[PDB]
Write a protein that binds this ligand. Structure first.
Ligand SMILES: NC(=O)c1ccc[n+]([C@@H]2O[C@H](COP(=O)([O-])OP(=O)(O)OC[C@H]3O[C@@H](n4cnc5c(N)ncnc54)[C@H](OP(=O)(O)O)[C@@H]3O)[C@@H](O)[C@H]2O)c1
Ligand code: SF4
Ligand code: SF4
Ligand code: SF4
Lengths: 313, 106, 111, 111, 206, 147, 75, 176
């Protein structure tokens, strides 16, 4: 097998080259110059951080825990980078018997990275950032499965290969008009660089899964946390975008698929700079109280539609 | 209609008249020769006559308050507490305490 | 009767004793909860020498003022506040000069 | 192979930890602290319950997650069975979930 | 006068009526000395009763001050009685400023202003820290502007500016930061004092 | 011989590339430390990224006055830093009290608590002068590990 | 009381700055044994932990001898 | 004057209620807020990179201390202890002895950078205009000993900044 090794090393570079965009686009959004000194346009700085944070930075926590803690950055990468495997792409690595089920299960398993980092420090200061990270993720897992079901019943089955073929004339944004707007919010269930987000950034509280971790484990967390942002951006570009298929020419698909994802890649960092944090209590009131009755009403609506007019795979 | 403060301006007239009539009776228990009774009475009697003359107009609220009746009511609500405390602790009627050491110039 | 301070001359003696009991029970608690530092046995002797320096007893005003001051510097661990092993350490550790000899202090040249 | 695909990603991830573990080494002093982030000595030593606040909303998720799993037949089951008999039953589970959330509106909790 | 005088006195006559109004009550328990100069009023109060004076000026119909915002204390060793607690008061409805003072040595406990004013307790903590003036029936007398293991009071004129314990080395001990070292850099004591009195009328007879 | 000598400079190039500061909100110096993030005089991804947390950062900037109440606090933060660490004491307060110095509470010069590598003398530390505090830092990192 | 004198004497002998054999039964801790103003009642405070009963501040001033302390311990 | 922060409900009936409900149901105004930073991305940044470009300043500016001298040699400082008394930090120290024969100008002259808040007081208090503040920025040392200025010497080595000082003082006489 060569394909897996050709989907980790160039992918870790994409999370590395993200650091440019994380302060270049975000910089111009705030009217400030980002990467400039290090490279021609600061292009040598993202690869410099790998030399900076791993080879020279040494920390291990004080009071600590036993085997757990250092188990958590292994759980961070080894569950978020595996998410690249079930992706349909032009051609998938081992096409699943049911596609999106593996995508939804491993995403919830990726939440454990911020959960086990609560017991990284035995001291109570770190676990407050963990307990906040529970509720900021636990509620949004409800709608994430429901809004999927309304799209999946509209087009094909759980298999991700069928989701490419179903969009031949028009996108799925237009039939699922309120549901597409939900997937700019529901995608930010995992601790991502955003305005909605979770307990990961500083601002008000101490940094979750970062105050306990070093540099080396803490550096490994960013290579997983920012990796999930690309993952949700690609996953939205499958469920809601498509444009064309073309099995004969893979070259025409690969260029067209990347532009659609890159426009969404900018959009989350667009969200991050623009708006403040939603608060621990009031994020639980955005969904559950307000958005859950809306999504279920649309779920009720999407059950009737294949019966009203023929729509069965 | 809403007041500026946290205390909501409730539509109640003669409510201000109750609290001002209450404090006049409290003053005439212990101090009589003292100036505290004689000086506070002339302010209250002048204020009570203004309420009787004006029929629920904003001009009655503009008489030595100018922040509606609700703000004036707060001064009357704490008036009974300060009058009772002045009667409890002897200071207005009695004057016999010691004086400090002769030094003031800096 | 000015000024009250807190208690009378004889009553002030038992107010210090009441303060002593609460602080005598805290020296085993300031090792396990805070830091190892020195010792439990040596810690108790550090308490006794502090009260011996303050021992005079001539006015109720002076004694009662020491109680309120004692209910802050020794109350720093009662409700559990941060000292960071730099505070609460009353005895000098890095200070080693204790010369009381006309022969000893004059050789070092002081005053 | 699914097994060979998952293990190669997992073994490469844990190997990167070893690189950051053994290369940087010079000195390890009694310098690392329990709380960090803001500084000072930890007032809350070890572990204490805290709890509450979100106790009702968290419990309801465990109850709701089972129903969404029971909603997963919808795109995959409606292929062979009769639609008219299913329509009354498929909506039925979604209707009652809105009824449970309607009972959640009358005093939601402390959250 | 064009640049010589700051402001002409016109409200001074009306402000002088306040100095008579409180004095017309005439308590030996409260009044003592009334001083009024430069558009302001100053009253000093007998130590035995401070709380009944603080209930006055607040609530009162003729003088509605209420807000007892600023709270200072004077450090002076010239008098037989040392410290002097000075209250600075402001009215929001009346628009005027008045001053309340205490005269006692106040090494012995003084009456607290916590039952009258809610923010005064934080200012009361400042006085006990800097000077060493205890307030009777005070809820929670915590240290603010002093170190956790600080001896004495850091503002008193009787002790030096540099302090007894001030220098903090890391030295041979691995984590414990030192305290007992007392030497600091030399502060130049200016012995300057100009001959001839600058102002008339301020001169006092021996 | 030549590969060994250039590899040590390659590790030192990473510190020459980027260093993350600590947001010590200690005094008025911290306001000008916020002006490093301000666009007109920027080190934002020129070599400085603000993130806080003493465990992740490489450089800590002591931004103002330190007291006896703060001496135990700052000391263990420096101990919470990873071993390749640099301290930049910026301002006259950080160098030995702006005024103060002969005061009771203020600890003189930070060097009594935590050792300093690069000094910035400026009270209102002008952002122009502040830029040396990071540029000279990178220039001072020359050689590490001979044997 | 039976089994009260034996328990109190064992705890007092174990404590520091006290004679193991010289002072026992009906002897004053401050007058006969030799103890400071704070050190005399400090031994009585440690004895309260061994028995399992809290001692008040008012009753502590009267107690000095172990024979007198044994009578006050019973409730 | 009263500006009033309260709007007292903008919605009333039919048209005024539905548009206020439309922004809360979906987004609209958040997309309007999204477009606010869109135009901010399009406009050029006002950024200055230090090693090549320099920032704006003033003709009168204070940095590192340097003492001036007369056009035909000689120390401009006369030794008064004046600037010593004005100094709020007391960073400047001065002790004077007669210079061989005739002239009496300085022996000890230390300005500690451990202190000094940069007032321009000593620049203003000086009658002979000895300490004139130049537009200095570059000062970085390994130790405190290297930071604090010695007996003139390094302060006399302000000749490399005295060319700018002569241009700056031309804006100082008959003030601005
Ligand atoms: N085990 C004990 O604790 C023990 C017991 C009995 C007696 N002692 C005595 O106490 C002393 C303890 O010292 P230590 O072992 O703690 O010192 P150390 O840790 O070995 O430190 C010595 C320093 O000097 C430098 N150095 C020494 N020799 C050098 C060379 N030939 N070339 C270049 N640099 C050199 C090293 O720099 P680089 O690292 O840059 O080369 C090193 O940092 C010993 O000398 C021993 O005689 C020790
Ligand atoms: S050096 Fe100056 S600007 Fe910096 S903290 Fe001190 S007084 Fe403020
Ligand atoms: S610098 Fe100016 S004021 Fe100071 S001693 Fe020299 S001549 Fe006098
Ligand atoms: S600028 Fe101010 S602090 Fe600095 S030497 Fe001159 S007078 Fe002293």
């Amino acid at each position: 097998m060569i394909n897996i090794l050709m989907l980790i090393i160039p992918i870790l570079l994409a999370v590395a080259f993200l650091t440019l965009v994380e302060r270049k686009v975000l910089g111009y959004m705030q009217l400030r110059k980002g990467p400039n000194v290090v490279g021609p346009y600061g292009l040598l700085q993202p690869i410099a951080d790998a030399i900076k944070l791993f080879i020279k930075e040494p920390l291990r926590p004080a009071t600590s825990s036993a085997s757990m803690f250092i188990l958590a950055p292994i759980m961070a990468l080894g569950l978020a980078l595996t998410m690249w495997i079930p992706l349909p792409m032009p051609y998938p690595l081992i096409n699943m018997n049911l596609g999106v089920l593996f995508m939804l299960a491993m995403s919830s398993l990726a939440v454990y990275s911020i959960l086990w980092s609560g017991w990284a420090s035995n001291s109570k200061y770190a676990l407050i950032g963990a307990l906040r990270a529970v509720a900021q993720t636990i509620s949004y897992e409800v709608t994430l499965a429901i809004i999927l079901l309304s799209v999946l019943l509209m087009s094909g089955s759980f298999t991700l290969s069928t989701l490419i073929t179903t969009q031949e004339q028009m996108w799925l944004i237009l039939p699922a008009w309120p549901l597409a707007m939900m997937w700019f919010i529901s995608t930010l269930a995992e601790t991502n660089r955003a305005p909605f987000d979770l307990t990961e950034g500083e601002s008000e509280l101490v940094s979750g899964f970062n105050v306990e971790y070093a540099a080396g484990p803490f550096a490994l967390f960013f290579m997983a946390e920012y990796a999930n942002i690309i993952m949700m951006n690609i996953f939205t570009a499958i469920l809601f975008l498509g444009t064309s298929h073309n099995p004969h020419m893979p070259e025409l698909y690969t260029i067209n698929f990347t532009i659609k994802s890159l426009l969404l890649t900018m959009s989350f960092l667009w969200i991050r700079a623009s708006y403040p944090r939603f608060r621990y209590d009031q994020l639980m009131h955005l969904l559950w109280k307000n958005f859950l009755p809306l999504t279920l009403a649309l779920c009720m609506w999407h059950v009737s539609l294949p019966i009203l007019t023929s729509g069965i795979p | 209609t809403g007041l500026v403060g946290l205390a909501v301006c409730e539509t109640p007239h003669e409510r201000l008249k109750i609290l001002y009539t209450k404090i006049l009776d409290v003053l005439g228990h212990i101090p009589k020769n003292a100036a505290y009774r004689k000086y506070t009475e002339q302010i209250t009697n002048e204020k009570l006559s203004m309420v009787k003359a004006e029929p629920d107009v904003k001009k009655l609220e503009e008489r030595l308050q100018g922040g509606q009746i609700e703000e004036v009511i707060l001064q009357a609500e704490n008036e009974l507490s300060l009058a009772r405390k002045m009667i409890q602790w002897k200071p207005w009627e009695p004057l016999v305490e010691e004086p400090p050491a002769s030094q003031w110039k800096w | 009767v000015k000024p009250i301070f807190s208690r009378d001359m004889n009553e002030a003696k038992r107010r210090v004793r009441e303060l002593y009991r609460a602080w005598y029970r805290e020296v085993p608690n300031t090792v396990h909860l805070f830091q190892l530092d020195i010792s439990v046995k040596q810690g108790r002797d550090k308490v006794r020498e502090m009260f011996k320096k303050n021992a005079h007893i001539t006015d109720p005003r002076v004694v009662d003022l020491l109680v309120i001051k004692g209910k802050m510097e020794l109350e720093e661990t009662i409700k559990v506040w941060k000292q960071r092993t730099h505070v609460m350490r009353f005895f000098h550790e890095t200070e080693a000069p204790r010369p009381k000899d006309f022969l000893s202090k004059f050789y070092v040249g002081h005053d | 192979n699914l097994m060979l695909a998952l293990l190669t990603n997992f073994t490469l991830a844990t190997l990167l930890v070893i690189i950051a573990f053994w290369l940087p080494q010079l000195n390890v002093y009694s310098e690392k602290t329990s709380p960090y982030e803001c500084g000072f000595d930890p007032m809350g030593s070890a572990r204490l319950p805290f709890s509450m606040k979100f106790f009702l909303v968290a419990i309801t998720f465990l109850l709701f997650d089972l129903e969404i799993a029971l909603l997963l037949p919808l795109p995959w089951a409606s292929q062979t069975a009769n639609l008219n008999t299913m329509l009354t039953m498929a909506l039925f589970l979604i209707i009652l979930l809105a009824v449970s959330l309607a009972y959640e509106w009358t005093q939601k909790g402390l959250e | 006068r064009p640049t010589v005088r700051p402001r002409n006195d016109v409200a001074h006559k009306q402000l002088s009526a306040f100095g008579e109004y409180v004095a017309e009550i005439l308590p030996k328990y409260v009044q003592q000395v009334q001083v009024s100069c430069f558009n302001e009023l100053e009253i000093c109060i007998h130590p035995d009763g401070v709380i009944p004076v603080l209930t006055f000026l607040r609530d009162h119909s003729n003088a509605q001050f209420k807000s007892l915002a600023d709270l200072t204390a004077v450090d002076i060793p010239t008098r037989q009685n040392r410290f002097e607690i000075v209250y600075n008061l402001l009215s929001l409805r009346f628009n005027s400023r008045i001053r309340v003072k205490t005269y006692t040595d106040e090494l012995t406990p003084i009456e607290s202003s916590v039952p009258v004013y809610k923010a005064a307790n934080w200012y009361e903590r400042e006085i006990w820290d800097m000077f060493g003036v205890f307030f009777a029936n005070h809820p929670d007398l915590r240290r603010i502007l002093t170190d956790y293991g600080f001896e004495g009071h850091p503002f008193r004129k009787d002790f030096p500016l540099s302090g007894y314990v001030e220098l903090r080395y890391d030295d041979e001990v691995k984590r414990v930061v030192a305290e007992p070292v007392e030497l600091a850099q030399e502060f130049r004591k200016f012995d300057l004092n100009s001959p001839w009195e600058a102002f008339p009328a301020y001169r006092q007879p021996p | 011989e030549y590969v060994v000598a250039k590899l040590d400079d390659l590790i030192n190039w990473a510190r020459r590339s980027s260093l993350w500061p600590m947001t010590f909100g200690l005094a008025c110096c911290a306001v000008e430390m916020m002006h490093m993030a301000a666009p007109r005089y920027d080190m934002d991804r020129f070599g400085v990224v603000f993130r806080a947390s003493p465990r992740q950062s490489d450089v800590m900037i002591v931004a103002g006055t330190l007291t006896n109440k703060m001496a135990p606090a700052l000391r263990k933060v420096y101990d919470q830093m990873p071993e390749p660490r640099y301290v930049v004491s910026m301002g006259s307060c950080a160098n030995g009290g702006g005024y103060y110095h002969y005061s009771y509470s203020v600890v003189r010069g930070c060097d009594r608590i935590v050792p300093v590598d690069i000094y910035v003398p400026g009270c209102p530390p002008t952002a122009e002068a502040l830029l040396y505090g990071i540029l000279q830092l990178q220039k001072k990192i020359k050689r590490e590990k001979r044997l | 009381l039976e089994g009260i004198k034996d328990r109190v004497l064992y705890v007092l002998k174990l404590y520091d700055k006290i004679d193991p054999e010289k002072l026992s039964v009906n002897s004053h801790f401050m007058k006969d044994l030799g103890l400071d103003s704070l050190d005399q009642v400090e031994i009585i405070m440690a004895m309260e932990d061994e028995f399992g009963f809290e001692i008040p501040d008012i009753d502590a001033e009267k107690l000095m001898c172990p024979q007198e302390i044994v009578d006050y311990i019973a409730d | 004057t009263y500006k009033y922060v309260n709007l007292r409900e903008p919605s009333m009936d039919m048209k005024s209620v539905t548009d206020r409900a439309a922004q809360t149901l979906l987004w609209t105004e958040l997309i309007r807020g999204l477009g606010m930073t869109l135009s901010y991305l399009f406009r050029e940044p006002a950024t200055i990179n230090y090693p090549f470009e320099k920032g704006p300043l003033s003709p009168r500016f204070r940095g590192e201390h340097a003492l001036r001298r007369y056009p035909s040699g000689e120390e401009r400082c006369i030794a008064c202890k004046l600037c010593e008394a004005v100094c709020p930090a007391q960073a400047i120290t001065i002790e004077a002895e007669p210079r061989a024969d005739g002239s009496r100008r300085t022996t000890r002259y230390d300005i500690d950078m451990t202190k000094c808040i940069y007032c321009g007081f000593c620049q203003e208090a000086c009658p002979v205009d000895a300490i004139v503040e130049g537009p200095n920025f570059e000062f970085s040392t390994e130790t405190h000993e290297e930071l604090l200025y010695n007996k003139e010497k390094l302060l006399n080595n302000g000749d490399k900044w005295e060319a700018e000082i002569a241009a700056n003082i031309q804006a100082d006489y008959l003030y601005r």
